[PDB]
Amino acid sequence: NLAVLKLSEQGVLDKLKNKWWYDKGECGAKDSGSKEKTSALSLSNVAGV
Amino acid sequence: ARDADTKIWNGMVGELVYGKADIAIAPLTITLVREEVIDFSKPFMSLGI
Amino acid sequence: ARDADTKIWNGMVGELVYGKADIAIAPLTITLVREEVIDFSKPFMSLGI
Numbered sequence: 001n002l003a004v005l006k007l008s009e010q011g012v013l014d015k016l017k018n019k020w021w022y023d024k025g026e027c028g029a030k031d032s033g034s035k036e037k038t039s040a041l042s043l044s045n046v047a048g049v
Numbered sequence: 050a051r052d053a054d055t056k057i058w059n060g061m062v063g064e065l066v067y068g069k070a071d072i073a074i075a076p077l078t079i080t081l082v083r084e085e086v087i088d089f090s091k092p093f094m095s096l097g098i
Numbered sequence: 099a100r101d102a103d104t105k106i107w108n109g110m111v112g113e114l115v116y117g118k119a120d121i122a123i124a125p126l127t128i129t130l131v132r133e134e135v136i137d138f139s140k141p142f143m144s145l146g147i
């Protein structure tokens with residue numbers, strides 16, 4: 001119980017958490033979704049014209 | 050968990066209760082009924098259903 | 099916090115260290131330097147800086 005707090009306060013937990021969750025980002029689809037309907041148009045929607 | 054009507058902890062918690070193991074570093078959720086047979090440290094990683 | 103060179107814990111710490119107060123249900127943060135003098139239950143509400 002004493003050791004856990006030292007690891008928590010030194011941030012090794014956050015380091016290991018990033019190491020084993022996010023640094024292995026392979027299928028980085030990264031779709032979140034913003035409701036901001038004032039997003040402009042890209043050229044990629046229009047280039048066919 | 051405990052068995053129905055017998056109170057026989059199978060699994061890892063039984064490995065702590067029945068003197069077979071020594072410590073369990075594992076993704077293990079602090080519930081109510083696990084406190085009455087074994088001890089937990091402070092929590093290290095937070096989560097939800 | 100503790101005093102430099104004399105370890106005089108003031109505030110709500112010394113009220114429990116020096117036998118003054120009996121229990122403290124309050125916004126107190128579990129640290130490393132507080133488990134040595136007093137004890138904490140399991141944490142009940144998460145937060146950050």
Ligand SMILES: NS(=O)(=O)c1cc2c(cc1Cl)N[C@H]([C@H]1C[C@H]3C=C[C@@H]1C3)NS2(=O)=O
Binds near residue numbers: 005013014091095096
């Ligand atoms: N966001 S999380 O689950 O990965 C997470 C969760 C926790 C961490 C650290 C992290 Cl990174 N340390 C805390 C402890 C540290 C100190 C403060 C509360 C406890 C004592 N336990 S916790 O609140 O369970």
Ligand SMILES: NS(=O)(=O)c1cc2c(cc1Cl)N[C@H]([C@H]1C[C@H]3C=C[C@@H]1C3)NS2(=O)=O
Binds near residue numbers: 140141145
């Ligand atoms: N959503 S919250 O911050 O108010 C919050 C935070 C916490 C709650 C319950 C709530 Cl509602 N219980 C947990 C405890 C339950 C069990 C598991 C860890 C501790 C034991 N501590 S906690 O993680 O500090």
